[PDB]
Design a protein around this ligand. Structure first.
Ligand SMILES: CC1(C)COC(=O)CCCCCCCCCCCOC(=O)[C@@H]2CCCCN2C(=O)C1=O
Ligand SMILES: CC1(C)COC(=O)CCCCCCCCCCCOC(=O)[C@@H]2CCCCN2C(=O)C1=O
Lengths: 107, 107
């Protein structure tokens, strides 16, 4: 499923609600440590609307467990990520993905 | 034959030679992405001697054209795999096989 593991505590009070835009910085890597992308390298935070289902299930369910200001490591099994397909040219088939996510703010 | 499609490049200069032990991680799938075996799943690299014929011909010709650190998707026709006999209870007769292979190192 998605396992969430705190790197830095957030405020423990403001959790995203469905319909809110989460603003995050992230780095994603394959289970073996090979990194495949980071918004920090573009220094452009990534934004998505929770509930809209435009990101993988592991992100929808993992980020909803986070409060503003938290930095956490989410390790996402293949069924909550890209499955047998992968993401062409970046993610291989059946890959467990590990993401370091920081929830900057809600909009 | 075997088609090699690269997921991530290796050095493009250290290719395996006859008699060397190739150390790889792999996932074996039928064309629909259904996984029938994976070394990753038992967390043990697979090792074989290039030129010994102990692995199907698509693996001997496919991995000979990979360089260290490369991860590639090999699509193997049945005549380079198990032909009409298949592999009892896992692979059907005349099945095209897809393997995700990462050449981790040479010994
Ligand atoms: C796509 C992928 C492989 C690679 O992403 C990029 O190379 C650039 C991202 C630029 C922003 C557009 C992304 C649109 C989101 C929809 C793609 C689904 O992606 C995901 O769910 C996760 C989590 C959010 C970051 C992207 N994401 C990922 O799995 C990734 O990191
Ligand atoms: C056998 C099969 C269905 C199942 O394989 C295993 O269960 C591997 C067990 C671990 C190693 C045992 C020694 C296997 C020696 C090689 C046997 C022939 O297999 C093959 O050529 C291909 C390619 C290499 C991985 C095994 N391979 C395959 O076609 C497979 O994945």
């Amino acid at each position: 499923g998605v396992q969430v593991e705190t790197i830095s505590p957030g405020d423990g009070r403001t959790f995203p609600k469905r319909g809110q835009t989460c603003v995050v910085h992230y780095t994603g890597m394959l289970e073996d440590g090979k990194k495949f992308d980071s918004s920090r390298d573009r220094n452009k935070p990534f934004k998505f609307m929770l509930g809209k289902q435009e990101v993988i299930r592991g992100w929808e369910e993992g980020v909803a467990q986070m409060s503003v200001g938290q930095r956490a490591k989410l390790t996402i099994s293949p069924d909550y990520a890209y499955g047998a397909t992968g993401h062409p040219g970046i993610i291989p088939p059946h890959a467990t993905l590990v993401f370091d996510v920081e929830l900057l703010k809600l909009e």
